[PDB]
Design an enzyme around this catalytic site. Structure first.
Site, PDB file in Angstrom:
ATOM      1  N   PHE A   1      -1.754   7.416  -3.853  1.00 18.29           N
ATOM      2  CA  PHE A   1      -2.829   6.556  -3.453  1.00 18.29           C
ATOM      3  C   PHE A   1      -2.779   6.422  -1.963  1.00 18.29           C
ATOM      4  O   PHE A   1      -1.778   5.922  -1.428  1.00 18.29           O
ATOM      5  CB  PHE A   1      -2.762   5.162  -4.099  1.00 18.29           C
ATOM      6  CG  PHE A   1      -3.961   4.326  -3.757  1.00 18.29           C
ATOM      7  CD1 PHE A   1      -3.994   3.600  -2.584  1.00 18.29           C
ATOM      8  CD2 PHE A   1      -5.106   4.352  -4.562  1.00 18.29           C
ATOM      9  CE1 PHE A   1      -5.128   2.894  -2.220  1.00 18.29           C
ATOM     10  CE2 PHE A   1      -6.242   3.652  -4.211  1.00 18.29           C
ATOM     11  CZ  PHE A   1      -6.253   2.897  -3.049  1.00 18.29           C
TER      12      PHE A   1
ATOM     13  N   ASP B   1       3.565   9.287   4.051  1.00 17.71           N
ATOM     14  CA  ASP B   1       2.759   8.093   4.043  1.00 17.71           C
ATOM     15  C   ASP B   1       3.656   6.861   3.848  1.00 17.71           C
ATOM     16  O   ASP B   1       4.101   6.611   2.748  1.00 17.71           O
ATOM     17  CB  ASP B   1       1.707   8.158   2.934  1.00 17.71           C
ATOM     18  CG  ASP B   1       0.817   6.916   2.935  1.00 17.71           C
ATOM     19  OD1 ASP B   1       1.123   5.971   3.699  1.00 17.71           O
ATOM     20  OD2 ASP B   1      -0.214   6.884   2.223  1.00 17.71           O
TER      21      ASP B   1
ATOM     22  N   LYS C   1      -0.717  -1.537   7.487  1.00 16.07           N
ATOM     23  CA  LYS C   1      -0.377  -2.795   6.818  1.00 16.07           C
ATOM     24  C   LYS C   1       0.373  -3.774   7.698  1.00 16.07           C
ATOM     25  O   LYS C   1      -0.225  -4.427   8.542  1.00 16.07           O
ATOM     26  CB  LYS C   1       0.406  -2.510   5.534  1.00 16.07           C
ATOM     27  CG  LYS C   1      -0.298  -1.652   4.542  1.00 16.07           C
ATOM     28  CD  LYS C   1      -1.475  -2.346   3.918  1.00 16.07           C
ATOM     29  CE  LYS C   1      -2.006  -1.504   2.770  1.00 16.07           C
ATOM     30  NZ  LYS C   1      -0.917  -1.202   1.796  1.00 16.07           N
TER      31      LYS C   1
HETATM   32  C1  LIG Z   1       0.677   4.153   0.568  1.00 13.17           C
HETATM   33  C2  LIG Z   1      -0.754   3.855   1.000  1.00 13.17           C
HETATM   34  N1  LIG Z   1      -1.442   4.697   1.796  1.00 13.17           N
HETATM   35  C3  LIG Z   1      -2.823   4.361   2.205  1.00 13.17           C
HETATM   36  C4  LIG Z   1      -3.458   3.248   1.784  1.00 13.17           C
HETATM   37  C5  LIG Z   1      -4.936   2.979   2.251  1.00 13.17           C
HETATM   38  O1  LIG Z   1      -4.886   1.827   3.026  1.00 13.17           O
HETATM   39  P1  LIG Z   1      -6.296   0.992   3.362  1.00 13.17           P
HETATM   40  O2  LIG Z   1      -6.687   0.192   2.147  1.00 13.17           O
HETATM   41  O3  LIG Z   1      -6.003   0.082   4.556  1.00 13.17           O
HETATM   42  O4  LIG Z   1      -7.370   2.033   3.674  1.00 13.17           O
HETATM   43  C6  LIG Z   1      -2.703   2.257   0.871  1.00 13.17           C
HETATM   44  C7  LIG Z   1      -3.389   0.986   0.399  1.00 13.17           C
HETATM   45  N2  LIG Z   1      -2.881   0.529  -0.934  1.00 13.17           N
HETATM   46  C8  LIG Z   1      -3.821  -0.490  -1.566  1.00 13.17           C
HETATM   47  C9  LIG Z   1      -5.310  -0.462  -1.462  1.00 13.17           C
HETATM   48  C10 LIG Z   1      -5.790  -1.589  -2.341  1.00 13.17           C
HETATM   49  C11 LIG Z   1      -7.252  -2.100  -2.297  1.00 13.17           C
HETATM   50  O5  LIG Z   1      -7.543  -3.225  -2.759  1.00 13.17           O
HETATM   51  O6  LIG Z   1      -8.123  -1.362  -1.763  1.00 13.17           O
HETATM   52  C12 LIG Z   1      -4.821  -1.625  -3.503  1.00 13.17           C
HETATM   53  C13 LIG Z   1      -3.483  -1.234  -2.851  1.00 13.17           C
HETATM   54  C14 LIG Z   1      -2.173  -0.955  -3.647  1.00 13.17           C
HETATM   55  O7  LIG Z   1      -1.535   0.030  -3.427  1.00 13.17           O
HETATM   56  C15 LIG Z   1      -1.422   2.563   0.506  1.00 13.17           C
HETATM   57  O8  LIG Z   1      -0.667   1.707  -0.345  1.00 13.17           O
END
Ligand SMILES: Cc1[nH+]cc(COP(=O)(O)O)c(C[NH2+][C@H]2C[C@@H](C(=O)[O-])C[C@H]2C=O)c1[O-]
Ligand SMILES: Cc1[nH+]cc(COP(=O)(O)O)c(C[NH2+][C@H]2C[C@@H](C(=O)[O-])C[C@H]2C=O)c1[O-]
EC number: 2.6.1.13
Lengths: 403, 403
Positions: free
Chosen positions: A141, A227, A256
């Protein structure tokens, strides 16, 4: 004075239905705690998917934001601001890469890494134009763009979302023979992988997986993109989760907690031979590298360092997992994680599930979110103390054993 | 005390080379003015591509940010915050659409619109899965993701950036016969178009273009996606640039000035029949709809309304264009724009170009950016007064006539 129910119904009316959140309406946060509109107090055991590693509204990070907003917030990259270079020098020296490329959201950092990988593929590796492939792990993800869902094996991500980005191949996670097989194709430019898969349910790979990935990528002239958007910045008990195996990726993604949740800041780190494949005018973002985000990011990193949060996450993580393992094996079937990125798997029946557990946790003063109906994440801010942690564990035990 | 040159060299060392900015190093901004590290004062005639329509650090917007950051900044969408619903009700009622979907950056709003269009295409229109096409106009700019560059006709955007997103077709801008031809294919779900193309060099289409687009989209059961990320929020002298022809798009994209440059906020507006094609769990963003961005966005919109900036942009725009048209036709070959989104085209030789003009404008106390070596944008904050505008015009005249 709007109630929790008013808040829910108002969103149902005027907002998209792209989420089904846990029914709790928060209005205040400080350190490890959240308060709802009724005044109820909660342990945050989600930390906004690691965005608030520093705790909600950390005063050092807030002071940086308040100081800078009175000065200058956004010029665009058409001109220079005075903060960006100070931030760039600081982060590059901290993680030991030549350069950083600033963006806003995690998915933007991912898109940037894909762009770098392709451009490096064509210009350095010598792949024929638009034959470049990027390999991904199943369960990955990295966001919600058309590209990002194109690499997903989650039908909720991709189904109904139009034809997909070509050149994205998928292999099983935690599978070195599969990576080795995939990398036989000289048109592979890169492999992107999370050191622990967050959204997949805190899927921790086998010891040696990360060093094996590094070895195979180097052997086959392929970029290793780590990542660390969720795993980085002290959450697992090191600066980077890849530090557990002393592994240096080609490209590191951060986001984050990079802002302590005060501002969408993300970063792409790599050396000159990769970074400089992108020329002036070929990539960017309106808000990327703006002076306000940069001031916040400096302060956020300084917090992690100053307060030794990595050491704290490692020490308290062990305590959390050991206590979780004392819950009956009939009800909790697995406990996993590193540092303060942890999860339990419950023996879901039709009577009872992760959602129901999280509803009762909320009733007992602790906020967590389920990730598949049998998985519950436990991920409090890294500023949490042992006595606070044990009080939380008591809530978790009370809740699980109350069924 | 770092100098301008120190600032440039530090970025060259530690940051990606994805920009070649105008050599000016800013540290403070207030209203229409910017200050560099040497203390030099400048008119901002770029307004961060319309992100600071309200002027730099507008006190109402700053007060919203300062008030809310002490309360709560980010819960993630795993839970409810109390601000989002208040923001959603306000913006939906203002623009008269059922619903809003909140995101952070402009490109994210664009990706969201593409996702909606496809999902609506398959679920409502009845297009066979993954045959859905989206049509775009040549000269379009909507960001830097792999999807967004896939619709670009600018080689600097797409060249070297790996295989492209299928299902994206391109027609000439300001061309109703071409749109009519493109829409014969029942697999077209949508047409995305900017009411004036910003990055292409303030390309204003012919009168009737927007009503013609609306008529054709309705006739052929195709969604009209208006990208008002730059043109919206009073910049052209109306709430939306499409208001000039009383045209209601199916989907409206907003960003930039939606926060007064204090926070990356973007929005996707449409009615229920489109919006609700996306179910819970199928789209989102970590920072999308966070309480801090929402407080900022409310205050930013309130400013635009309270201070009648649209009326101001319309009145002062006319003045700006009329004065620009008095410059010799040999040196300035065209003047174009609506409201305070304007540009001049210069008679570039090998001796002299838009870059050189912008260097001298800077020397004479005005910051603008060229967009092709012959185009210079003139786009000051909407809070600018007539006497301030005329002082700026005097700078522009002095500069142009000094060659
Ligand atoms: C490892 C990694 N690499 C990129 C991103 C994208 O980050 P971003 O959302 O800032 O584009 C994420 C974001 N993970 C989120 C998004 C979220 C929601 O509610 O959208 C649920 C949640 C749980 O994992 C990430 O964990
Ligand atoms: C109409 C429209 N639609 C979507 C977006 C994406 O917005 P975003 O950058 O927030 O993703 C933009 C952004 N336009 C920018 C980007 C910029 C840079 O330096 O990257 C140069 C500049 C000039 O036009 C836009 O004008």
């Amino acid at each position: 004075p709007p109630t929790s129910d008013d808040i829910f119904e108002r969103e149902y009316k005027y907002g998209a239905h792209n989420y089904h959140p846990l029914p709790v309406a928060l209005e205040r946060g400080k350190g490890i705690y959240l308060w709802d509109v009724e005044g109820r107090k909660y342990f945050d055991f989600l930390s906004s998917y690691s965005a608030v590693n520093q705790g909600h509204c950390h005063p050092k990070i807030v002071n940086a934001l308040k100081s800078q907003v009175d000065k200058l917030t956004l010029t665009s990259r058409a001109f220079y601001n005075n903060v960006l270079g100070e931030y760039e020098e600081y982060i590059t020296k901290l993680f030991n890469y030549h350069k950083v490329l600033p963006m806003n959201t995690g998915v933007e950092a991912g898109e940037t890494a894909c762009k770098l990988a392709r451009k490096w593929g064509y210009t350095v590796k010598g792949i024929q134009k638009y034959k470049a492939k990027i390999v991904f792990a199943a369960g990955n993800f990295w966001g919600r763009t058309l590209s990002a869902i194109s690499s997903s094996t989650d039908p909720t991500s991709y189904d109904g979302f139009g034809p997909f980005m070509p050149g994205f191949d998928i292999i099983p996670y935690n599978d070195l023979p599969a990576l080795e097989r995939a990398l036989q194709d000289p048109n592979v430019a890169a492999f992107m992988v999370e050191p622990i898969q967050g959204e997949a349910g805190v899927v921790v790979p086998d010891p040696g997986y990360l060093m094996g990935v590094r070895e195979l990528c180097t052997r086959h002239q392929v970029l290793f993109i780590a990542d660390e958007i969720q795993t980085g910045l002290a959450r697992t008990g090191r600066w980077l989760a890849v530090d557990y195996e002393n592994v240096r990726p080609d490209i590191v993604l951060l986001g984050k907690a990079l802002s302590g949740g005060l501002y969408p800041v993300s970063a792409v780190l790599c050396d000159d031979d990769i970074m400089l494949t992108i020329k002036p005018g070929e990539h960017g973002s309106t808000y990327g590298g703006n002076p306000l985000g940069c001031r916040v990011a400096i302060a956020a990193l300084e917090v992690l360092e100053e307060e030794n949060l990595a050491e704290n996450a490692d020490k308290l993580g062990i305590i959390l997992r050991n206590e979780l393992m004392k819950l009956p094996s009939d009800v909790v079937t697995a406990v996993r994680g590193k540092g303060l990125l942890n999860a339990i798997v419950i023996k879901e029946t039709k009577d009872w599930d992760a959602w129901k557990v999280c509803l009762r946790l909320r009733d007992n003063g602790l906020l967590a979110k389920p990730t598949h109906g049998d998985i519950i994440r436990f991920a409090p801010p890294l500023v949490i103390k042992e006595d606070e942690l044990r009080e939380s564990i008591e809530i978790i035990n009370k809740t699980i054993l109350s069924f």
